[PDB]
Amino acid sequence: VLPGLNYVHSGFPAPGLRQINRHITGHDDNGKSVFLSTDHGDHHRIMGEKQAVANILYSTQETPVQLNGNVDIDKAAKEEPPLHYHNGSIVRMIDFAPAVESPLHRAVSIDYGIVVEGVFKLVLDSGEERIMRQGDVSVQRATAHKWINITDNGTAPGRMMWILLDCHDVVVNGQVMEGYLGDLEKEY
Amino acid sequence: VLPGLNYVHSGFPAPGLRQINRHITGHDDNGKSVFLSTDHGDHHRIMGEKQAVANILYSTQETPVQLNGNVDIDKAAKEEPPLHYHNGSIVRMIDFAPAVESPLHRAVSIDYGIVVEGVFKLVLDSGEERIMRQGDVSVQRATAHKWINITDNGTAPGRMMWILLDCHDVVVNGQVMEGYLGDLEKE
Amino acid sequence: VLPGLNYVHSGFPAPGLRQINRHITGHDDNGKSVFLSTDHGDHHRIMGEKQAVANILYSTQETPVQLNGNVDIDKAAKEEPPLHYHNGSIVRMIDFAPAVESPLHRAVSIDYGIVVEGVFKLVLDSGEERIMRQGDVSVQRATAHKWINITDNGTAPGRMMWILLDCHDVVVNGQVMEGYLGD
Amino acid sequence: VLPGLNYVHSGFPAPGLRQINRHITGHDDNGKSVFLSTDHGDHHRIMGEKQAVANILYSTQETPVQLNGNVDIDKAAKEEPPLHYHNGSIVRMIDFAPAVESPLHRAVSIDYGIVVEGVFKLVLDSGEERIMRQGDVSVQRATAHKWINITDNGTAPGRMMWILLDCHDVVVNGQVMEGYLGD
Amino acid sequence: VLPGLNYVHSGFPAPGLRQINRHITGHDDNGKSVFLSTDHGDHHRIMGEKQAVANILYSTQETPVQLNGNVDIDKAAKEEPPLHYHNGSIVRMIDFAPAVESPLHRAVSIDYGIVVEGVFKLVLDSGEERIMRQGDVSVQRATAHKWINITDNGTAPGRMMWILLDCHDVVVNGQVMEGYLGDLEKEYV
Amino acid sequence: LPGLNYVHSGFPAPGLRQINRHITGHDDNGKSVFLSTDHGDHHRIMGEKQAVANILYSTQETPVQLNGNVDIDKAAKEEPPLHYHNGSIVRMIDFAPAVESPLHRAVSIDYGIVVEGVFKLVLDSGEERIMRQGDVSVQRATAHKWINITDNGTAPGRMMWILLDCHDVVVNGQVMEGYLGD
């Protein structure tokens, strides 16, 4: 039984989760701060067999970010970003179908995760786990892990948001803790 | 009357909002990914006359982040960070007392904001405004703004979270959009 | 300023409201009861200046309903139904942007209404109103009314669902109380 | 042990579920649309061993509905409706005790079902199943099915509302698919 | 416009609020602890113009409480208690209609109050007030006050629960602060 | 061990809300005023940081003596015991996920209410009731156990009890002794 098979029938948002507002601010040609856009995000991507859907709220590709001439807006909207940006950031929102889990994987990045809706289980390759509820926050420091949606005993959708930042490779007594995607390669 | 006067009586979390779990992962001596800590955050800071309380969930001070030797954990924990870090990041969570307002201010940083609980109004120096509900997200590109907690017609606490990154100066018509701390009294 | 102007930026569902599952059941080759579809509904229509959006979950066009050959499914999906079907039914679900209100209007129709999310004010042409919270049910008997979304003091979206049934013209004191769209 | 045995101890609403407001509209002497009554429904019926309770919010016995002289109101109030009315409608709300389920059964009618509170499992005789959460909607086309309250892993009450309409009987392979009451 | 007029049309619970379970425990003749009842409370009383309904979850009439022969159970069930029992307790739960307000009154009693549902404003005769949300608790020490249901800008019902205990008369400057009920007097006659 | 080290910052437990406790009083002009707004009193970690209690008030005589604010002083000065003879205790407890109390009996009558979550109340006869938010229990000196079953043992829960003094429960000439249990 593939969990969440064909659950996400209408892209973002997944059934049972809320449509959002993303607001981007900026300056007009008089120097006044205004809103530039209100929308549903960007670069929506179905994951698995309609088991999840990702939503890229923003991205940057250099540090510090260049805002003049609105080049960061164009850069974020021009291309769908990869897993993570070197010297940059990605804000990726993913809706989980009931009981959907990620593969055990490692990205070489530092990730700030917050539970937007539902209950998620964060399982590391050691077997240690934490149950994260709405509002709880994780700082994933380039560790091998998998995310499991356990909301309402596996009957409810859930939503996570991650902010992915660039980090150097993790080295433990000579050896690189190399990145691997498992089955998440298909989505990127 | 000043809103939220003496409302936050026991730091974080503000009365009416939930205590949190912050989980930090890392590697043990065998290269296994483990949980290093589970706590309530860090560098709690009362704001105003007990009108709000901030919670620094993490911070970084270089790009890319250096993680080996747990150097990033030490830097985040040994100093209270400033408003924002150059070439770095700050995850700042803030509990608002009912009807509490930020000053009209500008930080020279790009901020990813999300409403964790409640309803907030984002007003910009042009007078343009958006009402942001739980789960809504704003991308603040070094703009002058204020945050207004309006939850339950101004009778309920609210919680925001921001991730502040470093950004270059914004130059409009050859003039720098200089950052400024506000003053609510003069408004 | 117009309430909820440009609020509904991505059709159904409105921002702050949940996507739905509509399940339609049927019969297979050997008479076993199965599921024929799971979807977001049908015939989504923006209303006003992106101030609301309707979703037609189902409709029938005769009484009693004819299910054989799945022709009822065909009738429901092949054309967008009108406001109200004669000798039939319409399941119309509508997401309201914050503080968006309906025009005072009358349809020759008996309406089963349920608040799916939010707080609504039902106002009749006499001035009488009832505030309806989530799960409350109204039976509109061809009366003239307007629906006002008041969720969270006019700052939150709301969702109503109606089932509209055909009724005979209502006569009060020898006068037929006529339908009107208002706007 | 029977699920939800004696759980419903004071009729409608079941413990843990909210009392409702049912509003009925009508016309007064001068043709003004007014509210006629606000109540808790009608024809409350305990089901099983106090394992559930049904609330009939409205019914009609003819299409189109006759509303003049409030005869539809008097008919809806005068007698407890049956499972479903020929050429008519029934608004039937039911509170489920924790873990309670219906018998596998078939009514020859087309039902619109919406989850009012809780989480329900809709199992068909083929074994196919869908989980329906709050606001999810089902169109039951005279199929054989079970309703199972699974709210909070079988420890919480749940509420469903159905609008049952008359339908012609479903014929498969030349065989009348006969409605049965199960248990 | 009188707030909450005719809102409570079916007693307890008020429309928009949940029906409750009240479990009472006891002993059988073998010393085993058993459940004696599960119900909707006791002594339901509509208040005002069907603007509120009260639900007496329990009461006691002596201290310490006598439980043998289940006599405490029968004393609580056989009679609707007054506002307050000398040397005893009352658990009073009250459903408010939208925007419904109690009169300014004083009970010579120490009351433990908890907001079960909604948002309430506790106003004392000094003009001071506190907004109490769900889970918030007050300890009312024979003070003059009123309760205001302000849930959802005055359009939603709310529920409070109180545990009233007996207290001595509060004297301030050799003058007893006398209890008074105002329009609440019609509700306990 | 359920909830081991879950309560990492005292009251409130992670996932549960901070409270306001308001105590009213009298002016020197006889005016009813607010004397304090706080987070309760006498917080106590229980188990291996598996639960935390919060004492909202307590009284030590019946009827209660409010003059001179002596009731406030007595409630604040010392942490109360399990229950007070001739008096009351308002005890709020946050439970970590899946945490259960021991099977035990106190010689008191307890008014319980679920503030948040889902709790199973188990009596020594094996009889149980699942109590949800808003449900109330009248514990008449019975041997019992409380189990936090919120969201299948994965969420915290909160109960509040008002404990009152009762006489010994004698069944067939034998006193039903209290015990703390294991």
Ligand SMILES: CCCCC/C=C/CCC1=C(CO)C(=O)C[C@H](O)C1
């Ligand atoms: C097909 C089944 C799984 C689909 C959903 C996967 C989500 C979690 C994986 C993940 C992503 C997305 O690739 C990140 O962006 C980094 C973050 O830490 C974890």
Ligand SMILES: CCCCC/C=C/CCC1=C(CO)C(=O)C[C@H](O)C1
């Ligand atoms: C006493 C009144 C002020 C307290 C209310 C909250 C203010 C939020 C201001 C803010 C901060 C904190 O300095 C940021 O980190 C950036 C973010 O956009 C707005």
Ligand SMILES: CCCCC/C=C/CCC1=C(CO)C(=O)C[C@H](O)C1
């Ligand atoms: C842009 C502002 C107008 C749109 C807001 C929603 C209006 C609902 C009107 C309605 C319909 C749809 O036409 C029905 O299905 C009958 C039911 O009584 C009320």
Ligand SMILES: CCCCC/C=C/CCC1=C(CO)C(=O)C[C@H](O)C1
């Ligand atoms: C003893 C426990 C079972 C009884 C409780 C609920 C059963 C609902 C069955 C049902 C009815 C009831 O008449 C309908 O009206 C059609 C609708 O599809 C399902």
Ligand SMILES: CCCCC/C=C/CCC1=C(CO)C(=O)C[C@H](O)C1
């Ligand atoms: C019809 C207007 C009033 C309806 C709402 C009811 C409020 C009662 C307030 C109250 C009472 C009554 O005396 C108590 O039971 C003690 C406690 O302190 C507050």
Ligand SMILES: CCCCC/C=C/CCC1=C(CO)C(=O)C[C@H](O)C1
């Ligand atoms: C092993 C970690 C702690 C387990 C959870 C604690 C339960 C509270 C026990 C209790 C008390 C205080 O001992 C009361 O106030 C009476 C009420 O019935 C149950």
